[PDB]
Amino acid sequence: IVGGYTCGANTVPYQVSLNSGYHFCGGSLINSQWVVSAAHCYKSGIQVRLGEDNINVVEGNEQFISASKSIVHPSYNSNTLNNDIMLIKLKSAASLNSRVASISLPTSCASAGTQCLISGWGNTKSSGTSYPDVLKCLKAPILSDSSCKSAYPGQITSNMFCAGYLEGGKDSCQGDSGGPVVCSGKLQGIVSWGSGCAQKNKPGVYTKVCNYVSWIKQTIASN
């Protein structure tokens, strides 16, 4: 996350870190047995780490549970990143408490202008590499589809929305992929892609979760 702030330990209780010997993506807990992340974060051998703040220090509120199965969207396209969403089932149900909580799925899509909270352990430099150990947060508004499409001509589908600052300076970055974009108490986006990080006129692009609620509900109830 570039131009963000330190969230504070466990203030984003639904934030998950996907680990395959090291943190490689973020995710969101939707209920005790399931996590949603980005399909491009797919890997075999994932351990889900809940209740984290510093990912290099066991501070006492973590739960490390292995994934029993992963389901990438039936229409995910790795070339355009369209339908960039995946579901991960935990081998054991997590114990929800103050530090580990699930996030609600949206009943409707959010409007441009709505402020959201984006979080993750990704790079914090637009030009450079600095990986933080504690969770960083960023408040950013959803941008109009028109400013999103002018930034990325012929690359935005109805399953994506842009959030950020066209002036640049604040944005999600690598290591933040798969993490949450929460607006008004609902999970509305998933950190998907962008052009560099925090560049001018290059906002981040997010998977638009409101278009996948029936698929999520159906899939988790049948697995």
Active-site pick, 28, 37, 177, 192: 177
Closer to Ca ion by Cβ: residue 56 or 223: 56
Chain breaks in the chain (C to N over 2.5 A) after: none
Give catalytic status of residue 73 as yes or no.
Answer: no
Among positions 26, 164, 168, 194, the unique one binding Mg ion when judged by CB under 5 A: 26
Binding mask 136-175 for Mg ion (x = CB under 5 A): ----------------------------------------
DSSP string, the chain: -BS-EE--TTSSTTEEEEESSSEEEEEEEEETTEEEE-GGG--SS-EEEES-SSTTS--S--EEEEEEEEEE-TT-BTTTTBT--EEEEESS----SSSS---BPPSSPPPTT-EEEEEES----SSS----SS-EEEEEEBPPHHHHHHHSTTT--TTEEEES-TT-S-B--TT-TT-EEEETTEEEEEEEE-SSSSBTTB-EEEEEGGGSHHHHHHHHHT-
Q: Taking CB under 5 A as the rule, does residue 106 contact Mg ion? A: no
Closest distance between Mg ion and the C-beta of residue 16, in Å? Answer: 9
How far is Cα of residue 59 from the mean position of the Cα atoms in its chain? Answer: 23
* Residue 178, annotated as binding a ligand: no
Closer to Ca ion by Cβ: residue 54 or 80: 54
Closer to Ca ion by Cβ: residue 59 or 167: 59
CA distance 43 to 58: 24
* Residue 159, annotated as binding a ligand: no
Q: Tally the C-alpha atoms within 13 A of residue 53's C-alpha that lie toward its C-beta.
A: 11
Among positions 176, 181, 197, 205, the unique one binding Mg ion when judged by CB under 5 A: 176
Closest distance between Ca ion and the C-beta of residue 51, in Å? Answer: 8
Q: Which does 203 bind (CB under 5 to 8 A by kind): Ca ion, Mg ion, none?
A: none
Q: Taking CB under 5 A as the rule, does residue 179 contact Mg ion? A: yes
Closer to Mg ion by Cβ: residue 6 or 201: 6
Active-site pick, 53, 70, 84, 119: 84
Give catalytic status of residue 84 as yes or no.
Answer: yes
* Residue 51, annotated as binding a ligand: no
Among positions 4, 51, 106, 120, the unique one binding Mg ion when judged by CB under 5 A: 120
Active-site pick, 40, 70, 73, 192: 40
| Catalytic (active-site) positions | 40, 84, 177
Pick out the residues of the known binding site for Ca(2+).
52, 54, 57, 62
